[PDB]
Amino acid sequence: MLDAFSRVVVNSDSKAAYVGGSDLQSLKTFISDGNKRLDAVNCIVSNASCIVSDAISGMICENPGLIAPGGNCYTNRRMAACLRDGEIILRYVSYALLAGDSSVLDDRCLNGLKETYIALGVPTASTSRAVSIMKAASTAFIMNTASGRKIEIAAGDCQALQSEAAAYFDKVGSAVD
Amino acid sequence: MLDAFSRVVVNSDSKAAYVGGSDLQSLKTFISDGNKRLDAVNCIVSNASCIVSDAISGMICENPGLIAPGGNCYTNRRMAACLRDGEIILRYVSYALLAGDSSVLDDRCLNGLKETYIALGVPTASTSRAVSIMKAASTAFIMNTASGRKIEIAAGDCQALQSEAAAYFDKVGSAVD
Amino acid sequence: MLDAFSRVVVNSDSKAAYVGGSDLQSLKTFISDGNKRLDAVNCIVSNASCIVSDAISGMICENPGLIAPGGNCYTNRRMAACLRDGEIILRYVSYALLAGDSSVLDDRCLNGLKETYIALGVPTASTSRAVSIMKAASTAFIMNTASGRKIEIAAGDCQALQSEAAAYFDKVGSAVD
Amino acid sequence: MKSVITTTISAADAAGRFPSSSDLESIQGNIQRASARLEAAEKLSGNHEAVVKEAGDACFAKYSYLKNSGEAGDSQEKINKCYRDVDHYMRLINYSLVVGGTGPLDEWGIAGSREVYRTLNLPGSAYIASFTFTRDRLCVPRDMSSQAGVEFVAALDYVINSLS
Amino acid sequence: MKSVITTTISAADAAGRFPSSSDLESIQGNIQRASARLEAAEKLSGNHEAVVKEAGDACFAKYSYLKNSGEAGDSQEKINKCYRDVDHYMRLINYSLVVGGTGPLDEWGIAGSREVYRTLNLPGSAYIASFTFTRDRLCVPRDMSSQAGVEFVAALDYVINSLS
Amino acid sequence: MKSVITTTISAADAAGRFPSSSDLESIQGNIQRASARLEAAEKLSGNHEAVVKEAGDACFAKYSYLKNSGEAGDSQEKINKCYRDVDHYMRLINYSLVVGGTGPLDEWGIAGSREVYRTLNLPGSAYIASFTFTRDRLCVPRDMSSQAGVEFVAALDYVINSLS
Amino acid sequence: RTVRPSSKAEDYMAGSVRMQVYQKGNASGVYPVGGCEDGHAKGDADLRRVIALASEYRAAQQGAAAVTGAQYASSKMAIQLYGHSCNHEEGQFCDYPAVAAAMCRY
Amino acid sequence: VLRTVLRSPVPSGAATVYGYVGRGNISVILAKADEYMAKSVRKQYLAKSNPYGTFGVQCTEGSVKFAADFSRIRALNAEFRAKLGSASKKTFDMYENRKNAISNSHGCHHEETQFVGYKGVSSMYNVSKSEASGSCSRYASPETVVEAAMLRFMDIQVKMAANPTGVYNISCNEGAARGQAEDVRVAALNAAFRQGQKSLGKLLDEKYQQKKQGYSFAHGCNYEEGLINKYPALGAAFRSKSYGY
Numbered sequence A, B, C: 001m002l003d004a005f006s007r008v009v010v011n012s013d014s015k016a017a018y019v020g021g022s023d024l025q026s027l028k029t030f031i032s033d034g035n036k037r038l039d040a041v042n043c044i045v046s047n048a049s050c051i052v053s054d055a056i057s058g059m060i061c062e063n064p065g066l067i068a069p070g071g072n073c074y075t076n077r078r079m080a081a082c083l084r085d086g087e088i089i090l091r092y093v094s095y096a097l098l099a100g101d102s103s104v105l106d107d108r109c110l111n112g113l114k115e116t117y118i119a120l121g122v123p124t125a126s127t128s129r130a131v132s133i134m135k136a137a138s139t140a141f142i143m144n145t146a147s148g149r150k151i152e153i154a155a156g157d158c159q160a161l162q163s164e165a166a167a168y169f170d171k172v173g174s175a176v177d
Numbered sequence D, E, F: 001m002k003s004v005i006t007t008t009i010s011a012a013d014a015a016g017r018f019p020s021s022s023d024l025e026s027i028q029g030n031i032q033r034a035s036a037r038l039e040a041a042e043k044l045s046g047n048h049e050a051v052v053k054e055a056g057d058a059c060f061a062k063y064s065y066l067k068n069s070g071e072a073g074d075s076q077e078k079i080n081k082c083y084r085d086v087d088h089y090m091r092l093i094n095y096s097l098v099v100g101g102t103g104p105l106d107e108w109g110i111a112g113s114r115e116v117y118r119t120l121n122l123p124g125s126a127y128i129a130s131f132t133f134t135r136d137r138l139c140v141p142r143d144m145s146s147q148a149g150v151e152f153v154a155a156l157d158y159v160i161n162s163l164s
Numbered sequence G: 001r002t003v004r005p006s007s008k009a010e011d012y013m014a015g016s017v018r019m020q021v022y023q024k025g026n027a028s029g030v031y032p033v034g035g036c037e038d039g040h041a042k043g044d045a046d047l048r049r050v051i052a053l054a055s056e057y058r059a060a061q062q063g064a065a066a067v068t069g070a071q072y073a074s075s076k077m078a079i080q081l082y083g084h085s086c087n088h089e090e091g092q093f094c095d096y097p098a099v100a101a102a103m104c105r106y
Numbered sequence H: 001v002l003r004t005v006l007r008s009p010v011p012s013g014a015a016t017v018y019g020y021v022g023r024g025n026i027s028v029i030l031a032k033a034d035e036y037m038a039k040s041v042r043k044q045y046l047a048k049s050n051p052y053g054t055f056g057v058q059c060t061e062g063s064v065k066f067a068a069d070f071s072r073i074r075a076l077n078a079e080f081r082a083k084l085g086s087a088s089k090k091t092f093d094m095y096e097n098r099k100n101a102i103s104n105s106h107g108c109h110h111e112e113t114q115f116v117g118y119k120g121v122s123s124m125y126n127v128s129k130s131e132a133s134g135s136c137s138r139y140a141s142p143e144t145v146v147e148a149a150m151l152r153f154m155d156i157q158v159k160m161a162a163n164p165t166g167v168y169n170i171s172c173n174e175g176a177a178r179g180q181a182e183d184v185r186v187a188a189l190n191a192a193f194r195q196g197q198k199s200l201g202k203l204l205d206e207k208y209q210q211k212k213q214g215y216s217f218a219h220g221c222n223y224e225e226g227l228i229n230k231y232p233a234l235g236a237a238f239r240s241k242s243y244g245y
């Protein structure tokens, strides 16, 4: 776990000098951005449960072999483990949104999950499909273009931050496969 | 690779004595059986490809998540590797039928199959389902009770031998899981 | 574990209604105060180790029976335990300064301390003397009337808050006895 | 209780440290967000009655089968209970709103609510109909300030996302 | 590293919760206190050389016996070490000043410095003479803004109060 | 081990085919020749003791210089070793006779025997005197059936023609 | 702490089990008096880190006999306490013993 | 969220693909046994290439005054390319190396058990057998126009058997950096001329031996074995599929 700040500081420590203005200017873009990231995290963390439910239900909708006997979603046990895994994924993504760096996501969740799912026989393609659906649903919430729930926000441009969030979900989906 | 003969001889070598009438008596049951095993092997080896086709087709039929995109049967290449794997499984099973002992099946096919399928992400429960369908189809041909093809044979009792072949399929299905 | 806010809320919950404007008005006095509490806690927490050294040294100075053999400060080990206990007391006092309520002080430090010192034979009057000296030293820092170190602060009155901190140290000194 | 101050205090107590500038900074955020939330708390203490009345009335407007004589809410005392239950919820939204964070709303209302509501045959979708009715009847400028309203939104959504 | 957002995310991660409004108010305080201490960070990266020079020169101005031939700093290379060591310290004050909190300054400089300095016969009172010299030479209005200055004071005091 | 069914299954495995009618005819010849050499196996398990005893006794009846004080067979323990070695040989003839082929007799007895016998000063002509003594004492009708006897002859000759 | 897993999979599984135990203990965000508590007085946390890593090294150096006995023991014991004729968890205890050792939870 | 703070275990894909991981912490032991055991096979066959004690013509390794070190750099990079494989390539290599080790075992039960038991050990057996015997593609020498021609044709059909796709895989990889190619070209030419300078009976038993590898790869075809009786370099041209190339 390293935020934006600690990332700049560690890079300056490897460079072995003081941080300087340049890095401080990019940091002023982060802090000067601020409550766009705050309102964004408020949006994803608001509609969290519902994102996870819709995404995994859609994932079972694309291929009904999971809920077919012998599939990895065939029981209540397996379905519950499925739902909590999608929830934990969304959780760490939101952590990485407030953090501004993916250090927490890389260390605490990503590092050793692929081998683990392979050892347990979780199908990875299905997981990346679910990560993709959570990606689209979460970017649609974060841009407030969700067609069901559309709340009042102070207007402006926050596409760059949506690009950041898309990058973290692409990191997870690239990692699980 | 050890047949029933080599198994009796290895057991007598671990016992560190001569052969003896008991082990020779079980060997006289083997030799006295003989052409029941010959005709059995002729039956399964005759209808082998058709067994593989039916069993894999049924396996895709129980859960269509395989053929769903993201499933391990969604392509012609993955399906071809599927068909040749079922075929080679049945090939080593027929080897274990001529042999009378599962040594060839344990060494040449079983030793590192689970790890292979885990490394490739092959769903193990679907493989055990395919081995189960090949079990029932192979016992149905071996008893000549198949409802499509029923060829003329010299009459008798071959239940023991069916029990042996069922034991081999249960060994494979227990191994893949 | 309850701050100002949680104390208002718990009192309204025993009253079994909503919070209202009166309790919120007292809370607006708290929030409207704000950075005086911040600067206060910054002052005590800045010179904290120095305060513990001076207070415990003064405590040994008034009655040299503690450093006399048979006294509880007679050894390096027991002097060390004495100094860390003065430090921990000051730690929880600072926590009660940020909290605004003595809930953290009552639960996390005060709960079982008199019995513990009775069980160890620590003299309680000596402890109340050390808490008194930490009181005087800490109020002198918090008013910035310290005889050695006098740092720049935006001008104003912080006497209320010093009365709060004096209340906490009198709570600790009354508790240890 | 889960709050910014408690977290800063808890973190420092678990670490064994004096409170450095990080908790002070965290506290600064508390004293800066405070006014927006407390205004919303004032207005919630203003009109909670009409909030509960429209909430429960729209709740049975959606789900009529509850006043049928199977399902639970089929007597005047239990409609008083349903109305009463909501009033607890709005009062907890006022409590958590004044506190800052989800502390009292979690530890009084949410923790172990699953066993109780699953035991006493109580559907969550009725509650969610109530909360979402209030959230759709909400407003941008006319009753409240917009920014504080966002805080209110968050808390109400948390209740929904803690319930199902 | 100890900081605002790492404390809050760490606490939410240990608890297994989503980041609620409490962490949002914490990072609110972070993004509001930011500009001040980053200004102080800019000026520290400005004139660190004269800071180290006056620090070490006043350090040996107080303690002359170090350049005597017992005590360690009695060669030009070891006075370069003393000066070099201070430079580390000011750079970690810059790092922790940028981060917010005492994270990098604690985990790089303070943690286990007791065994090193107590092992290598290094007196802490020399360091403290240097830092208190810089803290007394600091300023209210003339070089910096007062508010940011307070942040700098905090970090420097922490170093002193983490030493002895 | 080298045998009929292992040669055919090994060939089908190296070829990657199902076992066709050719392997079926091979194991047909195995199950037709089987009863004869298993009868010879029964009689070998019958009287192996006097086979080893007359084998070794005639072996030292031919070669007396082994019990001379130079060579290995000059002590009672090593004559026990010589008899014991011959017992292992007759047991390997029984094993390979049961199997069918020369598999266990090759891989247990013949493989690496040259380095051991050449190393430990062991003459092969003594073994060949023993085996040829048993082969000359064999019989046509009295103990065995003639055809199975031929199988025994084959195995014993193989030993001699694998030895020198 | 004594048991060391023999795979990347048992690292992540074992880690996850431990996390889930401590999260089952304490739902609320505030830390609870007692518990882990590395810090009592300043300078404690670093010694905690050092004693922890040293005990990890001695946990690493152990013999074959000790390791195998610890794995059987941890599998059985954690089954007897936390696996109630439930083939999933009985399987994932007998499969990976370090997860079971995380399941001891005492 | 990893359980072990210090020296957390990281078994290699090869270690995991195999059954080496175990309860006893064998993975250290089995992995080590394989490495030591594998060298043993290589040193045995290197003992068979030079009975007399002086290094043969085969082991020359370099004519230019610094080309030996170049071969050392190239050998380690080739092992690194062997390590960068995917899952399916690893299981494909372990099964085909397994079956080829068993077909070269000539029915010895003991050896077959130790090839299934130690998959890593078998692969170096295949390679080192084919290098010691002399029945390998590098040691092919055409002796008519038609041998040279059919090694071109046969070679091309083998490379089409290995890469059906247009993408060149990891297995080919002539160079690592700049200037690698010309040096590999130099040493590759020096190998062929070096083969020209062998002794006589070595070349004769190499011919017979390449025919023997031709019979096995050919398996049951009168046609193919007829051609191997016509031209013996084709048996050297039967690479295994566990090479790419």
Ligand SMILES: *[C@@H](C)C1=C(C)C(=O)N[C@H]1Cc1[nH]c(/C=C2\N=C(C[C@H]3NC(=O)C(CC)=C3C)C(C)=C2CCC(=O)O)c(CCC(=O)O)c1C
Residues within 6 Å of the ligand: D011, D014, D015, E002, E006, E007, E010, E011, E014, E106, G022, G031, G035, G036, G037, G038, G045, G046, G048, G049, G050, G052, G053, H005
């Ligand atoms: C107990 C299981 C804990 C839970 C639950 C939790 O969320 N975190 C645990 C308690 C906790 N620990 C700290 C602070 C530190 N802990 C340290 C020890 C580790 N650091 C190491 O390098 C090693 C060896 C590899 C260990 C064992 C150290 C050091 C610190 C920081 C010390 C300092 O001076 O600040 C904290 C506070 C930080 C946080 O997580 O918010 C907590 C709650």
Ligand SMILES: *[C@H](C)[C@H]1/C(=C/C2=NC(=C\c3[nH]c(C[C@H]4NC(=O)C(C=C)=C4C)c(C)c3CCC(=O)O)/C(CCC(=O)O)=C2C)NC(=O)[C@@H]1C
Residues within 6 Å of the ligand: D059, D066, D071, D072, D073, D074, D078, D079, D081, D082, D083, D085, D086, D088, D089, D108, D109, D116, D120, D122, D123, D126, D127
């Ligand atoms: C209204 C939308 C429901 C329903 C409500 C009923 N609730 C009943 C019982 C009950 N409700 C709660 C939750 C409540 N108590 C609290 O202390 C708090 C928060 C602090 C809440 C939110 C509890 C704990 C209980 C049990 C104790 C009690 O009886 O009060 C209830 C009685 C059920 C029965 O006895 O059968 C009803 C009817 N009524 C409905 O029609 C809808 C579904």
Ligand SMILES: C=CC1=C(C)[C@@H](Cc2[nH]c(/C=C3N=C(/C=C4\NC(=O)[C@H](C)[C@H]4CC)C(C)=C\3CCC(=O)O)c(CCC(=O)O)c2C)NC1=O
Residues within 6 Å of the ligand: A033, A034, A035, A036, A038, A039, A040, A042, A043, A141, A142, A143, A144, A153, A154, A155, A156, A157, A158, D033, D147, D150, E024, E025, E028
């Ligand atoms: C503690 C909680 C907390 C929040 C939830 C935020 C909420 C918030 N957002 C903004 C402010 C803003 N918020 C956004 C965000 C948006 N951009 C869009 O395209 C979308 C509609 C939306 C993201 C989904 C933008 C663009 C601004 C700046 C608006 C402007 O200046 O025009 C402001 C005014 C101050 C500022 O400029 O930062 C506030 C209070 N702040 C807080 O303190």
Ligand SMILES: C=CC1=C(C)[C@@H](Cc2[nH]c(/C=C3N=C(/C=C4\NC(=O)[C@H](C)[C@H]4CC)C(C)=C\3CCC(=O)O)c(CCC(=O)O)c2C)NC1=O
Residues within 6 Å of the ligand: B033, B034, B035, B036, B037, B038, B039, B040, B042, B043, B142, B143, B144, B153, B154, B155, B156, B157, B158, F021, F024, F025, F028
């Ligand atoms: C090389 C090829 C080859 C064959 C094709 C078989 C053919 C064959 N089978 C039998 C003989 C036999 N074959 C069988 C087989 C069975 N009978 C049943 O009723 C079952 C359905 C079926 C097993 C699945 C049986 C039971 C006999 C003995 C009695 C009989 O004639 O049915 C015989 C007579 C000799 C004997 O008793 O063994 C022959 C030549 N043998 C060979 O060597």
Ligand SMILES: C=CC1=C(C)[C@@H](Cc2[nH]c(/C=C3N=C(/C=C4\NC(=O)[C@H](C)[C@H]4CC)C(C)=C\3CCC(=O)O)c(CCC(=O)O)c2C)NC1=O
Residues within 6 Å of the ligand: C033, C034, C035, C036, C037, C038, C039, C040, C042, C043, C142, C143, C144, C153, C154, C155, C156, C157, C158, D021, D024, D025, D028, E033, E147, E150
């Ligand atoms: C996170 C770290 C942090 C700090 C270090 C403080 C720093 C700080 N203090 C004040 C502001 C203040 N700070 C104090 C404090 C006091 N003045 C006195 O004369 C007393 C001696 C002393 C209490 C012991 C006072 C009284 C003010 C308001 C007026 C002033 O500037 O003095 C302000 C301006 C905003 C305000 O009015 O609150 C700031 C930024 N705030 C923070 O958030």
Ligand SMILES: C=CC1=C(C)[C@@H](Cc2[nH]c(/C=C3N=C(/C=C4\NC(=O)[C@H](C)[C@H]4CC)C(C)=C\3CCC(=O)O)c(CCC(=O)O)c2C)NC1=O
Residues within 6 Å of the ligand: E042, E043, E044, E045, E046, E047, E048, E050, E051, E054, E137, E138, E139, E140, E141, E142, E143, E144
């Ligand atoms: C990055 C942060 C940073 C700082 C905070 C300053 C700190 C600082 N101040 C001085 C130096 C100085 N600072 C002061 C200031 C003072 N005059 C007084 O009457 C008051 C006591 C006090 C203001 C409140 C003076 C007078 C000097 C010159 C001292 C001298 O030459 O005698 C020096 C030595 C170099 C110089 O001469 O400029 C340094 C490093 N410099 C930095 O680079």
Ligand SMILES: C=CC1=C(C)[C@@H](Cc2[nH]c(/C=C3N=C(/C=C4\NC(=O)[C@H](C)[C@H]4CC)C(C)=C\3CCC(=O)O)c(CCC(=O)O)c2C)NC1=O
Residues within 6 Å of the ligand: E059, E066, E072, E073, E074, E078, E079, E081, E082, E083, E085, E086, E088, E089, E108, E109, E116, E120, E122, E123, E126, E127
């Ligand atoms: C990241 C932060 C960081 C630091 C703060 C330093 C701290 C530090 N100083 C020394 C080492 C040293 N530090 C000093 C300094 C001193 N000379 C004196 O006369 C004074 C008492 C004092 C300056 C005020 C000296 C002289 C040595 C060498 C000591 C010796 O070898 O005898 C060492 C041992 C390694 C070395 O020899 O360099 C370390 C870790 N190093 C770091 O990595």
Ligand SMILES: C=CC1=C(C)[C@@H](Cc2[nH]c(/C=C3N=C(/C=C4\NC(=O)[C@H](C)[C@H]4CC)C(C)=C\3CCC(=O)O)c(CCC(=O)O)c2C)NC1=O
Residues within 6 Å of the ligand: F056, F059, F066, F072, F073, F074, F078, F079, F081, F082, F083, F084, F085, F086, F088, F089, F108, F109, F116, F120, F122, F123, F126, F127
């Ligand atoms: C599985 C089959 C099998 C065998 C056939 C034997 C073969 C065999 N014999 C010996 C070893 C021996 N064998 C003999 C036998 C001889 N004494 C003589 O006078 C005669 C020449 C000859 C009997 C005809 C002797 C004397 C030794 C010991 C030699 C010595 O130590 O000098 C050894 C070395 C190990 C040992 O000392 O026992 C072996 C492998 N062992 C086996 O495991």
Ligand SMILES: C=CC1=C(C)[C@@H](Cc2[nH]c(/C=C3N=C(/C=C4\NC(=O)[C@H](C)[C@H]4CC)C(C)=C\3CCC(=O)O)c(CCC(=O)O)c2C)NC1=O
Residues within 6 Å of the ligand: G013, G014, G016, G017, G018, G020, G021, G024, G084, G085, G086, G087, G088, G089, G092, G093, G099, G103
């Ligand atoms: C990496 C491997 C790994 C496992 C094997 C599990 C093992 C496991 N199960 C539970 C927890 C649980 N496990 C079960 C399961 C059971 N329900 C029953 O009726 C049966 C007896 C049994 C299924 C056969 C239940 C019900 C709980 C929750 C128990 C409770 O909260 O009361 C917990 C505590 C955390 C939690 O609540 O999830 C853990 C660590 N977790 C892991 O990380």
Ligand SMILES: C=CC1=C(C)[C@@H](Cc2[nH]c(/C=C3N=C(/C=C4\NC(=O)[C@H](C)[C@H]4CC)C(C)=C\3CCC(=O)O)c(CCC(=O)O)c2C)NC1=O
Residues within 6 Å of the ligand: H150, H151, H153, H154, H155, H157, H158, H161, H218, H219, H220, H221, H222, H223, H224, H227
């Ligand atoms: C220049 C000389 C020259 C040759 C001699 C051949 C030799 C040869 N045959 C095959 C390939 C093949 N060769 C055969 C032939 C056989 N089918 C059987 O039933 C019998 C055992 C055998 C005939 C007697 C088959 C079936 C294949 C394809 C094998 C497969 O894909 O499974 C391949 C691999 C490329 C391919 O698929 O075509 C090559 C190099 N090619 C050459 O370029």
Ligand SMILES: CCC1=C(C)/C(=C\C2=NC(=C\c3[nH]c(CC4NC(=O)C(C)=C4CC)c(C)c3CCC(=O)O)/C(CCC(=O)O)=C2C)NC1=O
Residues within 6 Å of the ligand: H042, H045, H046, H049, H058, H059, H061, H071, H072, H074, H075, H078, H127, H128, H129, H130, H131, H132, H134, H135, H136, H137, H138, H139, H140
């Ligand atoms: C013809 C047998 C054969 C060989 C030699 C083969 C692979 C192969 N071994 C090769 C090399 C190679 N292999 C060896 C080992 C070797 N040579 C011998 O004469 C003996 C008895 C050896 C050990 C069994 C050497 C000395 C070399 C030359 C030095 C070097 O290049 O490292 C090459 C060339 C490029 C490369 O390094 O990959 C190749 C392509 N594949 C085969 O079928």
Ligand SMILES: CCC1=C(C)/C(=C\C2=NC(=C\c3[nH]c(C[C@H]4NC(=O)C(C)=C4CC)c(C)c3CCC(=O)O)/C(CCC(=O)O)=C2C)NC1=O
Residues within 6 Å of the ligand: G001, G051, G052, G055, G104, G105, G106
């Ligand atoms: C009879 C009990 C017993 C004990 C306590 C023992 C060894 C032992 N474990 C010890 C420590 C120790 N052991 C544990 C073990 C532990 N952790 C767990 O999660 C569980 C379930 C544990 C029980 C095995 C902890 C938490 C600690 C405290 C942390 C620490 O102090 O490092 C100690 C104290 C000194 C040390 O750190 O080594 C000792 C002496 N050997 C024993 O047989």
Ligand SMILES: CCC1=C(C)[C@@H](CC2=N/C(=C\c3[nH]c(C[C@@H]4NC(=O)C(C)=C4CC)c(C)c3CCC(=O)O)C(CCC(=O)O)=C2C)NC1=O
Residues within 6 Å of the ligand: A050, A051, A054, A055, A057, A058, A059, A061, A062, A132, A133, A136, A137, A140, A141, A145, A146, A147, A148, A149
């Ligand atoms: C029949 C099996 C099945 C499903 C289940 C859905 C699942 C689903 N939701 C999507 C995507 C999706 N889902 C939601 C969330 C959702 N919409 C809302 O307005 C509210 C309130 C929601 C929670 C209740 C949003 C907001 C989107 C983005 C598209 C949009 O603007 O609505 C997408 C598009 C994925 C992509 O873009 O790659 C899919 C596949 N689709 C199926 O075929």
Ligand SMILES: CCC1=C(C)[C@@H](CC2=N/C(=C\c3[nH]c(C[C@@H]4NC(=O)C(C)=C4CC)c(C)c3CCC(=O)O)C(CCC(=O)O)=C2C)NC1=O
Residues within 6 Å of the ligand: C050, C054, C055, C057, C058, C061, C132, C133, C136, C137, C140, C141, C145, C146, C147, C148, C149
């Ligand atoms: C002989 C044994 C002995 C001691 C040791 C001292 C210890 C001591 N310091 C005090 C109190 C005290 N101490 C300091 C801190 C101190 N002063 C400074 O200006 C600087 C820079 C300091 C650290 C170096 C301050 C600031 C006060 C408050 C009084 C004041 O304004 O100086 C008090 C008064 C306590 C009270 O008010 O109840 C005592 C007893 N007294 C003794 O009899």
